[PDB]
């Protein structure tokens, strides 16, 4: 139900704490977090504290069960 999401691309490593219903698709959580950080949602990706990549296209409940609370946004820069 709750996550702490850290922006890896900022030297201060700021984080946001989001509380979310289990059934919310985690894609919406990633978008919301990117908007709070004012970075582009479309090119954002998300990993665990251990650095394991996550496919956001699953429920927030399932992300929490599989990976817990501590997640990190990484940019996916699109130009060459």
């Amino acid at each position: 139900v709750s996550f702490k999401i850290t922006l890896t691309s900022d030297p201060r490593l700021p984080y946001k704490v989001l509380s979310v219903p289990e059934s919310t698709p985690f894609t919406a959580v990633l978008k919301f977090a990117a908007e709070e950080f004012k970075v582009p949602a479309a090119t954002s990706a998300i990993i665990t504290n251990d650095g394991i990549g996550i496919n956001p296209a699953q429920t927030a409940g399932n992300v929490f069960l599989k990976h817990g609370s501590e997640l990190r946004i990484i940019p996916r820069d699109r130009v060459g």
Binding site: T8, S9, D10, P11, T27, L30, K31, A34, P40, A41, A42, T43, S44, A45, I46, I47, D50, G51, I52, G53, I54, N55, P56, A57, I74, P75, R76, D77, R78, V79, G80
Partner: protein, 239 residues
């Protein structure tokens, strides 16, 4: 070191980052470059022409096609597997310098199937951010392990010179360290141009990655792991 002439590198995308990347490796005396891009000459041919003059000892093979079509994709895989310095051997590295996610997913799909190590690079739209990433299928995260939101949500994809130069430079430095085995290879190196922040990370495979060949290479990786003072007149004391 002159063992650099022993290797072959494939570069996909000869735009901003890819062209600087190709020039740097040419000046280093890489054994062979393979260049892939899709459009006077074509981009890959214009690049080949300039690079040949910079270092006549480098071998070149270039291809002007879209690797994300069915016929060209198989050709792409053929040349990764057999277009190495010695014909019939794989290239030692693929470098992704393409400017969209579809082409990165295509390279990723190919390299997961082949078990081919590659590095991916990128620069942000607004030119103040970029990165490089080392993908050893099965050992480090592939590009599909942590897909960007737009890819995961199945949505259609519907100051530059400085940042591109930095990203290409660190890309080729990582290539040299990987091939020649000096220094520390970065599995991920970011560049935040606004605050001069260069985060390093090491990204790990997801056991349920969408790419089933990523999963199979993860199994093989685990199997392989399982298988093993000229003077001092002053009296200065270190303490």
């Amino acid at each position: 070191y002159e063992k650099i002439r022993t290797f072959a590198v494939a570069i996909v995308g000869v735009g901003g980052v890819g062209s600087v990347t190709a020039e740097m490796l040419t000046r280093c005396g890489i054994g062979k470059l393979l260049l892939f891009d899709y459009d006077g000459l074509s981009k890959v041919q214009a690049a080949e022409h300039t690079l040949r003059n910079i270092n006549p000892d480098v071998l070149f093979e270039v291809h002007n096609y879209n690797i994300t079509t069915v016929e060209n994709f198989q050709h792409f895989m053929d040349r990764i597997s057999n277009g190495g310095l010695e014909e019939g051997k794989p290239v030692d590295l693929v470098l992704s310098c393409v400017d969209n996610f579809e082409a990165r997913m295509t390279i990723n799909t190919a390299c997961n199937e082949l078990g081919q190590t590659w590095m991916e690079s990128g620069v942000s739209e607004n030119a103040v951010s970029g990165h490089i990433q080392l993908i050893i299928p099965g050992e480090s995260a592939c590009f599909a392990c942590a897909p960007p939101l737009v890819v995961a949500a199945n949505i259609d994809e519907k100051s530059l010179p400085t940042t591109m130069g930095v990203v290409a430079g660190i890309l080729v430095q990582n290539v040299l360290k990987f091939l020649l085995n000096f220094g520390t290879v970065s599995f991920y190196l970011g560049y935040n141009a606004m605050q001069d922040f260069f985060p390093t990370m090491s990204m790990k495979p997801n056991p349920q990655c969408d790419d089933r060949n990523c999963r199979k290479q993860q199994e093989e990786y685990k199997k392989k792991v399982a298988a093993l003072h000229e003077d001092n007149e002053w009296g200065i004391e270190l303490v």
